[PDB]
Design a protein around this ligand. Structure first.
Ligand SMILES: CNc1ncc2cc(-c3ccc(-c4cccc(C)n4)cc3Cl)c(=O)n(C[C@H]3OC[C@H](N)CO3)c2n1
Ligand SMILES: [Cl-]
Length: 268
């Protein structure tokens, strides 16, 4: 039961608490994502780690990053998850802007993710472009669930400590939609401790500029300050913006290919 025999690390992917690799299961040759947390250098995060594992282990959805299991060796905890070779939506943004077709196609898939979670009575809690991973063939999945830092995507009712529900995810989706349109969320320059009070105090963000009215109205519905006035995920799946602008999956692989051309051409 030795994960250094079971698995081979192929290349580093990034750095939550720990470091993550693209890996391979030597028994099946399945490409996996492997996270390694040193449990001797993260005492106060430990309660959150088993919380996140519990939740992902209860998900069995094609729109949620799969969890395959966990291994311990010494003080190292190995967490094995499905591997998504397209990168995050935030990664795809580094090589240029998305158009409304691509944005709508992607929000449609995130919305299916959220509709799954909310119908199983779970809340993602940290919807943002960096937490939306794509397979290389363009599937769109959710990762990096929130704990029950950076407040830019937080709904005002979660900031005020007011016990919240799944409508918090709809607000965050609204902010994610602005992030996919402008590259970054509202108030990106403010210090986060200032943003923690500007979000409940201010009127909701709107999308300003040369965008269709339907797109603008999609975001205005998500960003109602009163949560009971935000639409559910299933309602948003029939919103005019999604219905009129969402396209086949190859609209996303074109973004994946663009990002790959970008990296291979030496840009960073
Ligand atoms: C680019 N392909 C790609 N494919 C797949 C995964 C998968 C995970 C993953 C997620 C969550 C966890 C996990 C599970 C339970 C508890 C705890 C504390 N962490 C374990 C992994 Cl192994 C990942 O970290 N990344 C990278 C990440 O970087 C940060 C970003 N916000 C999201 O993606 C992945 N990347
Ligand atoms: Cl891209």
């Amino acid at each position: 039961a030795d994960p250094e025999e079971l698995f081979t690390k192929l290349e580093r992917i990034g750095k939550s608490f720990g470091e993550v690799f693209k890996g391979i299961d030597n028994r099946t040759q399945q490409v996996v994502a492997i996270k390694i947390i040193d449990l001797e250098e993260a005492e106060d995060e430990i309660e959150d780690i088993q919380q996140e594992i519990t939740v992902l282990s209860q998900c069995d959805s094609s729109y949620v990053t799969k969890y395959y299991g966990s291994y311990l060796k010494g003080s190292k905890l190995w967490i094995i998850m499905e591997y998504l070779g397209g990168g995050s939506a935030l990664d795809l943004l580094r090589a240029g802007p998305f158009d409304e077709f691509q944005i709508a196609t992607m929000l449609k898939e995130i919305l299916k993710g959220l509709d799954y979670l909310h119908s199983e009575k779970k809340i993602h809690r940290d919807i943002k472009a960096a937490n939306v991973l794509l397979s290389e063939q363009g599937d769109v999945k959710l990762a990096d669930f929130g704990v029950a830092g950076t407040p830019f995507w937080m709904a005002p009712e979660v900031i005020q400590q007011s016990a919240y529900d799944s409508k918090a995810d709809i607000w965050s989706l609204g902010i994610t939609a602005i992030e996919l349109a402008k590259g970054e969320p509202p108030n990106s320059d403010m210090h986060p401790m200032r943003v923690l009070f500007l979000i409940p105090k201010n009127n909701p963000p709107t999308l300003v500029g040369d965008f269709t009215k339907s797109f603008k109205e999609f975001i205005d519905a998500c960003l109602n300050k009163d949560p009971s006035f935000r639409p559910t995920a299933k309602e948003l799946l029939k919103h005019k913006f999604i219905v009129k602008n969402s396209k086949k999956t190859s609209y996303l692989t074109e973004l994946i290919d663009r990002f790959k051309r970008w990296k291979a051409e030496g840009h960073s």
